[PDB]
Design a protein around this ligand. Structure first.
Ligand SMILES: [Mg+2]
Ligand SMILES: [Mg+2]
Ligand SMILES: [Mg+2]
Ligand SMILES: [Mg+2]
Ligand SMILES: [Mg+2]
Ligand SMILES: [Mg+2]
Ligand SMILES: [Mg+2]
Ligand SMILES: [Mg+2]
Ligand SMILES: [Mg+2]
Ligand SMILES: [Mg+2]
Ligand SMILES: [Mg+2]
Ligand SMILES: [Mg+2]
Ligand SMILES: [Mg+2]
Ligand SMILES: [Mg+2]
Ligand SMILES: [Mg+2]
Ligand SMILES: [Mg+2]
Ligand SMILES: [Mg+2]
Ligand SMILES: [Mg+2]
Ligand SMILES: [Mg+2]
Ligand SMILES: [Mg+2]
Ligand SMILES: [Mg+2]
Ligand SMILES: [Mg+2]
Ligand SMILES: [Mg+2]
Ligand SMILES: [Mg+2]
Ligand SMILES: [Mg+2]
Ligand SMILES: [Mg+2]
Ligand SMILES: [Mg+2]
Ligand SMILES: [Mg+2]
Ligand SMILES: [Mg+2]
Ligand SMILES: [Mg+2]
Ligand SMILES: [Mg+2]
Ligand SMILES: [Mg+2]
Ligand SMILES: [Mg+2]
Ligand SMILES: [Mg+2]
Ligand SMILES: [Mg+2]
Ligand SMILES: [Mg+2]
Ligand SMILES: [Mg+2]
Ligand SMILES: [Mg+2]
Ligand SMILES: [Mg+2]
Ligand SMILES: [Mg+2]
Ligand SMILES: [Mg+2]
Ligand SMILES: [Mg+2]
Ligand SMILES: [Mg+2]
Ligand SMILES: [Mg+2]
Ligand SMILES: [Mg+2]
Ligand SMILES: [Mg+2]
Ligand SMILES: [Mg+2]
Ligand SMILES: [Mg+2]
Ligand SMILES: [Mg+2]
Ligand SMILES: [Mg+2]
Ligand SMILES: [Mg+2]
Ligand SMILES: [Mg+2]
Lengths: 193, 162, 46
RNA sequence: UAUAUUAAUAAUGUUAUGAAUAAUUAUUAAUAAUAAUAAACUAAGUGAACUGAAACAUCUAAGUAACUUAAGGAUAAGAAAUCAACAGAGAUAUUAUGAGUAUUGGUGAGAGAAAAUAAUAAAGGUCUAAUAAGUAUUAUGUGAAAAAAAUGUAAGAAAAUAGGAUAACAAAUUCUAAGACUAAAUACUAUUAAUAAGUAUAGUAAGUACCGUAAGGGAA
RNA sequence: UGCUGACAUGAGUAACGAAAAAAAGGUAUAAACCUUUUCACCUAAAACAUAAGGUUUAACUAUAAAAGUACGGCCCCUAAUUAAAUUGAAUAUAAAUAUAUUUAAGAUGGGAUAAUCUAUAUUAAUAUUUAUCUUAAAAUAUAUAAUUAUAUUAUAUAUUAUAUAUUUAUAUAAUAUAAACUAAUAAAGAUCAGGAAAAUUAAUGUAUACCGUAAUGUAGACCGACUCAGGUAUGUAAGUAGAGAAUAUGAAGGUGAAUUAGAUAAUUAAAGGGAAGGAACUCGGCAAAGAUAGCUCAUAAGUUAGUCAAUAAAGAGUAAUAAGAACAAAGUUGUACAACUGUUUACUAAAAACACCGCACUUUGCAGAAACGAUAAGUUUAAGUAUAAGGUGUGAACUCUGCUCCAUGCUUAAUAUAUAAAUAAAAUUAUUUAACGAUAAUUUAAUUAAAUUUAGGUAAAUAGCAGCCUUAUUAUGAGGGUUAUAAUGUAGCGAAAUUCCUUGGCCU
RNA sequence: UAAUCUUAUACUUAAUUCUUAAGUAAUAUAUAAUAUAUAUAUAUAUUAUAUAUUAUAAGAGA
């Protein structure tokens, strides 16, 4: 959010650098790592991030890149750490608490462009510029096409809300059964707000 | 069934047939063999062979005492069962077995000594001679006569050393 | 609008998509090349 | 740059600085490559629908059309784990009687053997295996309209003192699976000869002219 | 409505396909061919150069001339993309084949030298689009180092006179119209954030390959059955006048046609004018007519504050006061539908239908949802990560979106619960052997799910939102009672594009 | 968890290059012995024997 040209940020995925290593007497002994541990911009393994910190660019594996909370104004909160199991509970922006490997990359802060969601295009042409083509509602289709089509006048055909290819689009969970996320503490709030 | 050529399917094969409902309606279906990727150990190759095999052949391998015995069965049935991949492997197992059992000695140096003499002779008459041609020309010669050089030994390529 | 002018000539496209090599370098192309030959046609391809 | 490269030589020019050295001319040894190559017949995989059932789904059409793959002048099959019945035959292939016969079917439409006797047929039996196991068999899903042989998953023997064959059992009979080669009678193409109650719109042109972008259609 | 061939009738009828022609001579052979003159049409083309295409149709067989310097291809390099190509065993797949990586091919693109003309080879070493604004200063006009106004903001090469290596090059100083326009750096505004790929020196070397080149190319020379009023890419496109490539003429060029010559009946098409009325026409102002600046001022109500309205209507300034080319320029208002610009039925419907920005619901934690894959590897999603992507409905914005999950689904919790497959063991039975035995079905034996059921939630999911009696003296019912349902039509609007009765009652 | 599954990256002989083989160089792993230091155990060093010259790292896991 607050990054500006001039600030200094550093990465500690390899670990504590040499400068602090020779400064252990005045750096680690007083535990003034907290000065740099919770700072906006620098990236730490979730192991060194204190509980409750707001973080983004969250990975899944120790040798993997950040994958979660990269979009505009997105953030995640670290909830718990489990040294024995080498897993950490990371509250995630969708609201789903997910297990993540302790030594997973994490950048502190929220992501920039908070007010992106408040933007508003003014004309259809604007969208076209970004590569968004028109979407035709099923109701306007014909029966051969989207199931909702057909019928004289405006009518939904007493057909449930379905995708063109025959999949319910209203509250139907696609991921079901064996092929489910093996790592999740609590489901994301379905009602959300 | 070209997928079989890449593994040891033991003659297994796909079957195309019908499915029957209680109304006796007929619709086509395929029967695919149970293919499993397994890495077995070869004693003579001293390394783990890893190919796709069906479950039936794996059980047959267990009863026959390893891949090596499976791939070296004389009975014709086995030859048919072993696909292209099995044939090539059989060659490996058998050739390696012969090499261990039959050492070369139960010439390379001689040709090394002979080469400089012949190249000089060819250069003297204005021609040339390269090693590859030297091997090609003198590949089938059983005994190299002592025209030059000295036989300061009694080897005869037999009973090396004392 | 007016029709009938569907064939707009172009030597590059005509040769690239109906030429001899456009058919001699493919399984399906070769098949129709040999079918025309068996029928005895003089002009095998473009 | 195969009128080529490397090497050697004779000479020239010729750098280099007598010799060398490459460049060239000319000889000799070595180093290297050219896929249009048919169609039909055979075998294997996958495999429809129109149609018939006076509708239609089991069934039929049909393992046909079509696509794909491989080989030879042919290919396939072939010397019984075959038939048959208490008496016997003795490989394979094609045709006739057997026979529209047993057998089978929303017991509808329909489908339909074998034994045995004849004809063509060629010398027609003969070892090439150390005699065959995840094999026979069982359960299960498939699988030639009657007649099985095969196959997906898994379980799984015996040694001629044994094993296969029939709903099942007891007798009896017959054969030996998990190893193999095999002419001839057959199919297709081409050539020669003979015979045409065959052809001049099935009598030689031309897959041309022309139509289509193309597959393709196609005259006088 | 048979197939093929030949010949009739319609019938010497319709038609000969945007059009300006005339005389003289080639030629006592010409409307149609050639030449000369006159007239006319096209002229930001019907002209001149080109691209693609094509029976070479051309000014023709004696025929379209390239080392390169504005000459293109060829050649180097790649984009989109393509590939019987490459990778005991790259991955997958009944065959066909598909996927990923490499390699190769592929212009619609990029490629130093050059009129003071230039030299490409071998060896060796080490750049999306877009504008030039304002201040300043010089210089100029009226006024007095001050002030008002004004062309210019940067380059493009000639002449004169001087200094350098010495009449070849550079530098200096002075002189030299306006309006367009060209390529190069400069400077700088927006988000829609703007291609890929292939070095320098030193020496030596260059005997300049092949192909394109005619003419037509807004058309008689290509695609359209035709010497077809249709379709076809690029640059100049004289001047005069204009804001202008509009409109008027036309210098030069080209051109004036496989139909001609007479009267132009009724009638048809395209145009010009029309008295007195001026929509009475007609389903309906369909058609036609209507322009008092084109520059400079001025310009209301409403309103989402946007000269949106608006090019506002009327009006004013510039010679016009009877008129005299062409083009640009054609009023005001109410209502219904839709926010608006846009898209749609090639060839009868352009709209009120599609899209739209906006709103709302929902799935997916990335080893993901969605889609494709005889079916998989795998690909798009995305080199993205819940403010992202997929699906659904509504469709800018002001005031709002009341009620109910009964039914179809969705979703959470309950072993409450039946059933298929898979298995051992063990009892009766049946067939057979004389016997143990062999073969068959039957039943008992603890080990099950999803499903189903029950109870919730979910309507901006699919959906629904009733009926009778009578109470304030004459009317109605604020109100009172009645059946069952999950709910029982809230705000708003109302003879609606929703109203048959209906041309509903009243007003303009 | 060596069930499965996903992700990333030297000399010498015998048959110019390739391969086998006895010996030894260096790395890694495992066992036995010796010595040292702490509370029978842990850590380090030396000697000997055996194997390797598809692996390493991360994740899911009966
Ligand atoms: Mg529609
Ligand atoms: Mg449908
Ligand atoms: Mg046509
Ligand atoms: Mg194409
Ligand atoms: Mg029928
Ligand atoms: Mg059949
Ligand atoms: Mg077949
Ligand atoms: Mg044969
Ligand atoms: Mg045979
Ligand atoms: Mg018969
Ligand atoms: Mg036997
Ligand atoms: Mg069975
Ligand atoms: Mg039949
Ligand atoms: Mg036998
Ligand atoms: Mg044609
Ligand atoms: Mg007739
Ligand atoms: Mg008439
Ligand atoms: Mg007439
Ligand atoms: Mg006429
Ligand atoms: Mg005349
Ligand atoms: Mg004009
Ligand atoms: Mg002009
Ligand atoms: Mg021209
Ligand atoms: Mg290339
Ligand atoms: Mg080009
Ligand atoms: Mg030309
Ligand atoms: Mg020209
Ligand atoms: Mg024309
Ligand atoms: Mg044409
Ligand atoms: Mg003129
Ligand atoms: Mg012309
Ligand atoms: Mg004409
Ligand atoms: Mg009048
Ligand atoms: Mg009048
Ligand atoms: Mg009227
Ligand atoms: Mg009237
Ligand atoms: Mg009008
Ligand atoms: Mg106002
Ligand atoms: Mg106008
Ligand atoms: Mg209204
Ligand atoms: Mg609209
Ligand atoms: Mg519009
Ligand atoms: Mg239309
Ligand atoms: Mg219209
Ligand atoms: Mg949108
Ligand atoms: Mg999916
Ligand atoms: Mg969305
Ligand atoms: Mg709508
Ligand atoms: Mg709205
Ligand atoms: Mg609406
Ligand atoms: Mg509502
Ligand atoms: Mg059961």
């Amino acid at each position: 959010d607050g990054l500006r040209p001039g600030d200094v940020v550093e990465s500690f995925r390899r670990g504590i650098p040499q400068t602090l290593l020779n400064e252990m007497g005045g750096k680690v002994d007083p535990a003034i790592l907290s000065v740099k541990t919770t700072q906006r911009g620098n990236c730490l393994p979730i192991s060194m991030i204190p509980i409750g910190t707001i973080i983004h660019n969250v990975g899944i594996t120790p040798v993997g890149p950040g994958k979660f909370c990269r979009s505009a104004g997105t953030y995640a909160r670290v909830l718990a750490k489990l040294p024995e199991k080498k897993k950490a509970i990371v509250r995630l922006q969708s609201g789903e608490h997910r297990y993540v490997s302790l030594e997973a990359v994490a950048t502190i802060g929220v992501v920039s462009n908070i007010d992106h969601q408040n933007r508003s295009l003014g004309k259809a042409g604007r969208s076209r510029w970004l590569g968004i083509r028109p979407t035709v509602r099923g109701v306007a289709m014909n029966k051969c096409d989207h199931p909702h089509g057909g019928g004289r006048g405006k009518s939904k055909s007493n057909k449930l809300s379905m995708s063109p290819w025959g999949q319910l689009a209203k509250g139907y969970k696609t991921r079901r059964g064996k092929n489910q996320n093996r790592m999740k503490v609590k489901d994301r709030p379905r009602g959300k707000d | 069934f070209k997928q079989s050529n890449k593994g040891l399917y033991g003659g297994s094969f796909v079957q195309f047939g019908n499915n029957i409902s209680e109304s006796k309606a007929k619709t086509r279906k395929k029967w695919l063999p149970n293919v499993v990727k397994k890495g077995l150990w070869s004693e003579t190759l001293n390394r783990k062979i890893s190919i796709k095999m069906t479950a039936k052949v794996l059980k047959t391998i267990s009863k026959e005492g390893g891949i090596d015995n499976y791939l070296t069965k004389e009975k014709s049935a086995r030859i048919k069962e072993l696909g292209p991949t099995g044939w090539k492997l059989r060659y490996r197992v058998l050739k390696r077995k012969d090499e261990i059992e039959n050492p070369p000695h139960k010439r390379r140096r001689l040709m090394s000594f002979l080469y400089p003499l012949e190249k000089l002779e060819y250069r003297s008459v204005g021609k040339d001679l390269n090693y590859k041609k030297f091997v090609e020309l003198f590949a089938d010669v059983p005994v190299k006569d002592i025209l030059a050089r000295l036989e300061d030994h009694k080897f005869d390529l037999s009973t090396i050393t004392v | 609008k007016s029709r009938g002018n569907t064939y707009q000539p172009s030597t590059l496209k005509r040769k690239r998509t109906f030429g001899f090599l456009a058919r001699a370098k493919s399984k399906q192309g070769s098949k129709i090349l040999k079918r025309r030959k068996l029928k005895g046609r003089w002009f095998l391809s473009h």
